[PDB]
Design a binder for this molecule. Structure first.
Ligand SMILES: CCCCCCSC[C@H](NC(=O)CC[C@H]([NH3+])C(=O)O)C(=O)NCC(=O)O
Ligand SMILES: CCCCCCSC[C@H](NC(=O)CC[C@H]([NH3+])C(=O)O)C(=O)NCC(=O)O
Lengths: 209, 210
């Protein structure tokens, strides 16, 4: 594999980049890190910001999940057709990251106490993405332009973990609903999503979702 | 008229890095200031994609998201490394910067009185990675990545400046970051901007805490 992913045995911040690699027909190696090996301290001290994931592309070593996504977007051509599209791809990815940050905070620090409020506020957080789709060819292709981008995989991951969190949360959004159906049916991605390496890994660290 | 417009509250906040980049690159731009009062009316907010500022216009291209604005400018002004490897390291630095900015913002706006002491205590460990990056790039003598300035240097510069206001002397434990701040603040167009009323006379954050 020109690629190595180093991470804990969870989907978490590596699900989108794994979907991207599978859908793009790329091979990669998973190096898993147990809470025991990490807890020790050795690898953590060697990680730039003391966190995972860690990714290797040949001799290039990178940290930061959005950095890995952008790198694969640049090198495999999933970053829009021109600078204008590349800017909009970024804009969608940063909006996905902002919601992902709220989700992680719910999961890891206020699950049973914050859940109902999170779900109640959910439709307002997803509307921007339905609006974006509505402005790009009636929401019949991808989030930006008419070719898939790295932001499509991150957005897809985000919508799917939110349907696990609040079943039917996309029922009120036709374009977002259809987009998930369509992307999930791309041949290589459909196979990946149905596979044990994806299905049998917990979404998060602590058993909550 | 300038092709660029920045729409934001009258604070340095998340626009300080992108204003330093435009000033340093000798670009002109227009500022459209939104008062707390205009924002409470509610109409401009309902029109923003994610309900927040900043908002930036390049010609008819309207962008939201502070890091998206930096990356767009990095692309169009040639401040994104000399090749693909360099762009990925630029991204890695910027995301590190954003992670620390997020913690800084949380402190300033939701826990300043009680969290300031723990935050300052944990700071050296949050700044070390940037000293390390500098140490690996030509002995910390040039920029954070490669040997041309990138958008990440401006964002990193702002983050280091606001942390020197929060914990004066916090960079004394970091020789490469200290010299780097002094070397960048000395660039002719940037030095002029940093000492001008339009920078100096805006508060760093919205609530009187810094
Ligand atoms: C063990 C439970 C599994 C939980 C997985 C959640 S993500 C793992 C967490 N890493 C991050 O949060 C990385 C954030 C970084 N901004 C990125 O986007 O890559 C970490 O390494 N934390 C370990 C640490 O901080 O030491
Ligand atoms: C007058 C107070 C000073 C403003 C605080 C500094 S940033 C303002 C805040 N915007 C953001 O948090 C932007 C986060 C966004 N991820 C970005 O990187 O651009 C906002 O628009 N908030 C307004 C709102 O959310 O309604």
């Amino acid at each position: 594999p020109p690629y190595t992913v180093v991470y804990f045995p969870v989907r978490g911040r590596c699900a989108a980049l794994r979907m991207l690699l599978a859908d793009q027909g790329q091979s990669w190696k998973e190096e898993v890190v147990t809470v025991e090996t990490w807890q020790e301290g050795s690898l953590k001290a060697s990680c730039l910001y003391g966190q995972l994931p860690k990714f290797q592309d040949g001799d290039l070593t990178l940290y930061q999940s959005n950095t890995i996504l952008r790198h694969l977007g640049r090198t495999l051509g999933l970053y829009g057709k021109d600078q204008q599209e590349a800017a909009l791809v970024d804009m969608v990815n940063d909006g996905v990251e902002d919601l992902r940050c709220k989700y992680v905070s719910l999961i890891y620090t206020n699950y049973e106490a914050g859940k109902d409020d999170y779900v109640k506020a959910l439709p307002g957080q997803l509307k921007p993405f339905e609006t974006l789709l509505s402005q790009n060819q009636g929401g019949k292709t991808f989030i930006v332009g008419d070719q898939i981008s790295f932001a499509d995989y991150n957005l897809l991951d985000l919508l799917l973990i939110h349907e696990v969190l609040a079943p039917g949360c996309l029922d009120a959004f036709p374009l977002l609903s259809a987009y998930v159906g369509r992307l999930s049916a791309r041949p290589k991605l459909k196979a990946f999503l149905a596979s044990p390496e994806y299905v049998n890994l917990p979404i998060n660290g602590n058993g909550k979702q």
